[PDB]
Each structure stands twice: as structure tokens, then as C-alpha cells.
Amino acid sequence: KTPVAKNGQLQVVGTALLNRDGKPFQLRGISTHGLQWFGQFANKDAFQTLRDDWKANVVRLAMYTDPNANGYIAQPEWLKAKVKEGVEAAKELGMYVIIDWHILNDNDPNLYKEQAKRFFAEMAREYGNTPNVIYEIANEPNGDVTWEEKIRPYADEVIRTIRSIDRDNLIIVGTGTWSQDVDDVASDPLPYKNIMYALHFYAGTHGQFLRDKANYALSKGTPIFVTEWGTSDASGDGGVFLDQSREWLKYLDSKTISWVNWSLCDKNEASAALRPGADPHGGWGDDHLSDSGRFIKAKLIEALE
Ligand SMILES: [Ca+2]
């Protein structure tokens, strides 16, 4: 029985994500790399391998926005079509699916706020009628871009647009310093239904100092969802950090915090789950899973156990 058939319409109560029966529920899965670069993996066959064999219950569609990255602003119809294919695939498989407005070098989400509103309004009219879709409205605010000054104002307007159409599907809002500054949200939280706040980390870079920030946020009532994390270090030059990854996943499991690994592609970098040449349509043998991918697959299987 599929994840969506078993869990239905999710709800946020306090810090906690719950399923349709009010039971605590953890989403676990993996993100595409940028759809403009590694979109070949965002298909129903790859996703079925993730569901059936890896035991993932969520996928994330990383739609870069920055036109210099060949993001949505440079080629909106072509990228929107990829997002739709990804969402339709997830719907057919009964998986949850995150539509990620993947800001990064465009470090202030306000830069493309009008485009974000129109895009998410469309996504909500198309997909807001079933439980699957999750709207991630600003991947990683960074630089001099704070909760009070820039992120919350952006989020309030985009959330009002979404909530005028889709009253209940989850919305996840990024936080300052590449979605680290979750401890700033409680100073002025958003008064809408089913909102959670992003925490991102790399196992080779972040440790207890960032877990303390998460705990502080949780203690003030801020719901956290890890929409992106890596097994490598921030630069990616350290190889993989599996004992540090295990420590982080133990922490997230203890708090029933949902998590999404980066990334499902075959780029020659430590955080990529697949080895170069891996089949876009799934069924990956061990030869084409990287050290990171082998670990993530095993952890997902173990969690369902
Ligand atoms: Ca809905």
C-alpha cells in the first residue's frame, strides 16, 4: 500500500508532522539535483525504484530559479514541464512530492517573488486537490537575508497566494544562512495552516552547534523539516562522512523530523547517489550506486524495518 494511501492528508500540529489519523509521521527520501542539469532522473521509473526498492516515501524536484544557472527565470515553460512530469509520476506511485523553488545564487527570494507567486498558484490549482504535493517556496535564503527583514515578508505573500487555493497541503519555508537559522522563526512565526521551516546540513561540515539551533527552534514551537542534507562536506572535497551522517539521522529520527538527501544524480561528486552512467530509468545495481547512495538506500530500507 502506497505512502499516500496509508497516510493521506498530512497536518502540522505544533512542531509535529502527523498523518490523517493524527499519528506522528516521518517522510524520508531524496532530491533531484537541478532539473535543468540532471532532469533525466525525474521520472516515474526512477521514482518507482525509489518507492519499491529504496523504500523512500517522498521525492524532491529541485527547480533552480536563477537565470544564470539556466533556472526557471531563463526557461520557465521548459522547467515547469519537467516539474509536472515529476509530480504526475509521484501521484501515480502514491508518493509525496516536494516542488522546490530552488533559490541559491539568487540569495534573496524577493528578487523573483512575482514569478514565484504565479508559479505556485498554478501548481496549487493543478495539484492542490490531492495530498501528494508539498510546496517548498525558497530553498536557501543566504547572505544578508534575514527572517524578519526579507524571508518572512516573501513567505507571507506567497503563502497567502497558495492558501487561497490549497488550504492544507504542506508549505515549507527556507531559513537564513542556507536554511540554518531556524532559531529566528519563533520571533515572528507565520499564522497559517500547515507550515514548516527548512533545516539544511552537510554531515562533513555541521554538527552539534547546528543541532543546538534546531533544538532551540523546536523548544519555541517551530516545526522543522530537513528538505536537503548531504553526506559530504559543504565543498564536497572530503569524500563521504558516514558516521557523522548516522549521528545526524539518529538525531532527526529521535525528533521524528522528515528528511531528504541530496542528490539523485550521477555527477562525479561525493554527495551524488549514483555513479556516472547510471540508468535514468532506475533499477540501479550496486555498481551504479555511489558510497553515498549505498548508505542512503540502506538507511531508508532500515527505517521501514
Ligand atoms: Ca489540498
> φ and ψ at 47, to 5 degrees?
-70, -30
Asked about 228 being catalytic, the answer comes back as yes
CA–CA gap between residue 44 and residue 90 (Å, rounded): 7
The structure was resolved experimentally with X-ray
Nearest 5°: the CA angle 43, 44, 46 is 70
Q: Clarify whether 157 is annotated catalytic.
A: no
Measured in Å, residue 167 CA sits from the centre of ligand 1 at: 6
Beta bridge partners of 13: 16
Expressed in angstroms and rounded, the spacing between residue 172 Cα and the centre of ligand 1 is 14
Q: Which residues contact 165 (CB under 8 A, 6 or more apart)?
A: 121, 124, 125, 128
With contact defined as beta carbons under 8 Å apart, do 24 and 221 qualify? no
Q: Which of 85, 228, 302, 305 is catalytic?
A: 228
Q: Cell 516515501 belongs to which residue? A: 57
Phi, psi of 254 (to 5 degrees): -60, -30
Q: How far is the CA of 132 from the centre of ligand 1 (A)?
A: 9
Cα 207 to Cα 31: distance, rounded to the nearest angstrom: 22
Q: Among 96, 98, 92, which Cα is nearest to 25's?
A: 96
- In sequence order, what are the beta bridge partners of 18? 11, 24
How many angstroms separate the CA atoms of 64 and 72, rounded? 6
Grid coordinates belonging to 102: 530552488
Q: Give residues whose Cβ lies within 5 Å of ion ligand 1.
A: 128, 166, 168-169
Reduce the DSSP state of residue 56 to 3 states and report it: coil
> Residue 16 has what DSSP assignment?
E
Please state the residue numbers annotated as binding site for Ca(2+): 128, 166, 168-169
Domains of the chain, by residue range, sit at 1-305
Å from CA of 112 to ligand 1 middle = 25
Assign domain 1-305 to its CATH superfamily.
Glycosidases (3.20.20.80)
> What are φ and ψ of residue 184, in 5° steps?
-90, -15
Give me the resolution in angstroms, 1 decimal: 1.5
Distances (CA, A) of 36 to 33, 43, 64, 179, 300: 9, 14, 8, 22, 27
Q: How far apart are CA 35 and CA 58, in angstroms?
A: 17
Q: Which residues of 254-274 are buried (b: 16+ CB within 10 A; e: fewer)?
A: eeebbbbbbbbbbbebbbbbb
Q: Give the ranges where the chain is alpha helix by DSSP (H).
A: 3-7, 35-38, 44-49, 76-93, 113-127, 152-163, 176-179, 208-219, 242-254, 291-304
Cell 534575514 belongs to residue: 146
Give the containing element (helix H, strand E) for 229. strand 224-230
Instruction: List the catalytic residue out of 136, 140, 149, 247.
Output: 140
